[PDB]
A paper describes a structure:
PhyBY276H has been reported to form photobodies such as phyB-Pfr, shorten hypocotyls, de-etiolate seedlings, and activate the expression of light-regulated genes in darkness, indicating that the phyBY276H mutant might be constitutively active and possess a Pfr-like structure. Furthermore, we explored the interactions between phyBY276H and PIF6 and found that phyBY276H interacted with PIF6α, PIF6β, and PIF6αΔC in the dark. The overall folding of the phyBY276H‒PIF6β complex was nearly identical to that of the photoactivated phyB-Pfr‒PIF6β complex (r.m.s.d. of 0.896 Å over 979 Cα atoms). The chromophore PΦB of phyBY276H adopts a “Z” configuration, which is identical to that of phyB-Pr. No photoconversion of phyBY276H was detected under red light irradiation. The Y276H mutation induces the HP loop (residues 560‒595) of phyBY276H to fold into an α-helix, thus leading to overall conformational changes in phyBY276H. These observations strongly suggest that phyBY276H adopts a Pfr structure and is constitutively activated.
The red/far-red light receptor phytochrome B (phyB) plays essential roles in regulating various plant development processes. PhyB exists in two distinct photoreversible forms: the inactive Pr form and the active Pfr form. phyB-Pfr binds phytochrome-interacting factors (PIFs) to transduce red light signals. PhyB covalently binds the linear tetrapyrrole PΦB as a chromophore. In these structures, two parallel phyB-Pfr molecules interact with one PIF6 molecule.
Author numbering:
A (entry chain C): 111 to 143, 159 to 249, 251 to 337, 339 to 379, 393 to 457, 460 to 511, 513 to 565, 578 to 614
B (entry chain A): 55 to 90, 95 to 142, 157 to 250, 252 to 336, 339 to 379, 393 to 454, 461 to 483, 486 to 511, ...
C (entry chain B): 12 to 32, 42 to 60
Write the structure that this text describes.
Amino acid sequence: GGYIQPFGCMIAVDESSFRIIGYSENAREMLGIMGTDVRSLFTSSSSILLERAFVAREITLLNPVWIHSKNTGKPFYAILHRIDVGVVIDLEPARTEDPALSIAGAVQSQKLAVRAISQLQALPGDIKLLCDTVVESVRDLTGYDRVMVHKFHEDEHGEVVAESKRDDLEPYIGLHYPATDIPQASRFLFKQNRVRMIVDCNATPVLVVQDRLTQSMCLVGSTLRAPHGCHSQYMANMGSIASLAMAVIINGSMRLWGLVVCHHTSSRCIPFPLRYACEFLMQAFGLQLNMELQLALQMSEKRVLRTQTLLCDMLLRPAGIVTQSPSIMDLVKCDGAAFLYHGKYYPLGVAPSEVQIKDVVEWLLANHASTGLSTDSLGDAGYPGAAALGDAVCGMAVAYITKRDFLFWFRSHTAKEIKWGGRMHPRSSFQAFLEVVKSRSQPWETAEMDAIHSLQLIL
Amino acid sequence: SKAIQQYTVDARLHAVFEQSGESGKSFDYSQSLKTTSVPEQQITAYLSRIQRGGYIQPFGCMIAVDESSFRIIGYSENAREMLGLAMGTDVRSLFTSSSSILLERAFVAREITLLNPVWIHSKNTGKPFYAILHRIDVGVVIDLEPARTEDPALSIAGAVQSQKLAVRAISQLQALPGDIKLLCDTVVESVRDLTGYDRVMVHKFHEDEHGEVVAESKRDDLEPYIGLHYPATDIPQASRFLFKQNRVRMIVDCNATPVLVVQRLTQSMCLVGSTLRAPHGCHSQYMANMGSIASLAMAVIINGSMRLWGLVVCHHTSSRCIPFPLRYACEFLMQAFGLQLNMELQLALQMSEKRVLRTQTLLCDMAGIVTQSPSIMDLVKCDGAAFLYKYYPLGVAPSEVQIKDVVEWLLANHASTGLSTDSLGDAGYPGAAALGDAVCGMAVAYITKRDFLFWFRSHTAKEIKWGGGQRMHPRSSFQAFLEVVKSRSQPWETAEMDAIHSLQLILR
Amino acid sequence: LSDQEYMELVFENGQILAKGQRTKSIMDLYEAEYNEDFMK
Ligand SMILES: *C(C)[C@H]1/C(=C/c2[nH]c(/C=C3N=C(/C=C4\NC(=O)C(C=C)=C4C)C(C)=C\3CCC(=O)O)c(CCC(=O)O)c2C)NC(=O)[C@@H]1C
Ligand SMILES: *[C@H](C)[C@H]1/C(=C/c2[nH]c(/C=C3N=C(/C=C4\NC(=O)C(C=C)=C4C)C(C)=C\3CCC(=O)O)c(CCC(=O)O)c2C)NC(=O)[C@@H]1C
């Protein structure tokens, strides 16, 4: 069996007969204590609560169960989930032994969530402000030494887009890392239980003993699951001894937009009420973020349509499209652009020389002789050159207008706009990412190709 | 604005109701609305009565404590009854040691309290209470709402189940097709399942501040209300203001006997921060007439600086008192609904702008603006339109002679680059009667000394349908509303006038 | 985060107006207040 973090216990019992299938090694010590009835290890009301949880059609509705051990009477929070052959309960000790304080905390787990979400309501089309507000709220609730918002990109590589740290620590905003740092399995696991918590990396994992059993049960859904070899040492290097990642889920069938990752320089365990306050705040944050993304898409469509209308007005009033304040560099987020017309070359911004464009159009007529390619790396696309262009002109989007008249949008390598100052470690990840996109521009988004095609089809 | 003017009307109606009660007579809703400046004393008295009152609902205790030495400075008459006590004694002696200490901690904290509400136990009986504290300009108010004598695990389980049901409702909300009506229906069903009330409705406040029932979920025995429009005065502005602070308003039993609040002090205590605040007499009469014995209302606040877009109203045909955690869950679900609704409204505005832009372009390309598919009537929401050069009728429009007379009146009294009226009679057109209610509202755009663009719209009730007045009852409210809008059409929005003037400029 | 403060409508002058009545983190507040020493 796998391993679990030593701050909690796990007991796996048969769904029907309520007998022990398996258990973590430390369970017997933590409870004050194979194949035996589980209900004899707790008080009676606890046993009826457990039976109600088991019989429930959707066990998730009764997850955080308040239970008392029969041998000590101390309270535990149980969380239940059905693996494929039974049920598993993760037991975390509760700090408060007072029923009054317990009820007060359970109620203010909701009160704090509502209070925090009120601030999100207060904000007036600005994802940056939203992310900073969320980070500040989460740092106030949790008290971690660092909180950041990682956004995942179309290429599945992440960027730290917001942060809130101590004064003594170093900033990470603007840091990019390759997608391989977060395995795809974990990204899948974040559409499952949406909160990962690591209390202390430098902690001996505890073995899960299983009974005469078939293929070992999967702990992929448990919350006490120990961290893996990569990430434990990666964190030890990074200088973070505790962590708490919370998924940001939006619509897209649901998709993962990013994470809210918190780091602490020492072992830390957040109480349940604040944990659930954070969970509810995350739900609200994802909702608002999804709506913001939709509205941003609509506004971008509006802007592109107006730009295209002006360009059409001029184009019907040839070359003048590339001579006025509005120009072909306004449809797309491009470092440069160019227009070939009757053999005349009209470059704007970072564009290659005339002979270079003649060579590239000859190459196009040789290999892609069509309507127009679009690549984030000219050298990789099959262009024999791309060394004379250095890092100034890397990605190209082409639109064929005639047999000799063409439109080009040029984009420089994806390190020009990346600004961050400064073994498994963030610096190594940044250098690896820079190697990955070497001479590679940003992807030409689908909407941008739609705009280019709209301009093309009307000329 | 009309919202600020409505305070005088509220004061007048409140005075009329008080007079009718004094004389022992009935309250004549129809004539009260028909016949209704005001001295500052009357408005001050109205606001003090609503917000100072003196009575609470008899489903809990209220105690006011002075922050110094914890001395009582006022309490409801039933406080002793539940706490199985005199003005100027120690509140900490009523409860047990642990509860007293937790209350001291709730007192000490500043700018935020994590012991609020507090689970306390009375000294003499051990009865569990939820103590809810807040600050008033003379001390603190403690609302004691009784609790159920169950094991702590069961209270925690109830709170957990309420939380999870709210979470499921929000998950269903987010995972919806891109339609405000579907959102309203979904939230109506979710809230009805969560709470357990016999009826749930969504009220939308219009530009005139008058309400409307846009969604509803009821048991099959009750009469439906979806589709009803009632005048703005049914909800006084003081309550709407209070709704942006107390997002959840609960009335347990409209037929219960209010309890007097016993109270050095110069003025009556303020109860706007208390949930035990009993309702006014005439809303209790309204509820009795409707047949609703309980009620629960939740505010739909959207960012517009927060606006009250509307309300979600729950009704039960008998007394009903839900616990506090379920009220928290309802508030959370309402916050999610408000966020979604705000963003839906913004998206709808953007789509409307897009559609109007496409229509304007098509019209500019190609009087062809009438004798073609995307004609002028598509520019704005109207029941008809016309272009006067010769006259080109289209849709519900006045005859050539009627429009000729309208133009003569426009020249006589306005000479002006545009008109936007929702009632020709209110404007003062002599021939409005000859148009009946087909042509009530008119928008006119000037093209030149002789060319005009007309957009005609008919009376509001044309698009208002519901299955149904001296007594205060929903039928009386609907009849009064229909009385208000007689020769008046729907109001021309700002966006519609922007589009009208855009086309005017482009044509000229 | 902070506690809710309530505002009372008044009719002052010739206008209606609403008249009114931290360094530690929420975790530190929770630890400070939900503490069980006072029960020996
Ligand atoms: C191992 C050779 C590879 C790898 C594996 C790996 N990664 C995760 C999950 C995470 N790693 C993250 C990455 C970062 N954390 C940071 O602080 C920064 C930058 C400042 C980076 C780049 C993130 C995000 C996570 C979240 C997981 C979490 O628990 O918080 C895992 C999951 C293991 C587990 O026990 O859950 C694994 C095995 N990471 C590498 O660097 C290389 C490529
Ligand atoms: C009394 C003389 C005047 C008045 C006062 C009044 N109105 C309210 C609040 C509400 N009235 C509502 C009206 C309706 N409720 C319904 O279900 C329907 C059905 C279509 C109608 C027309 C609504 C809604 C409310 C809010 C509900 C809530 O829970 O508050 C109040 C509020 C008092 C309070 O204590 O909350 C008062 C004092 N109503 C009149 O008609 C006259 C003019």
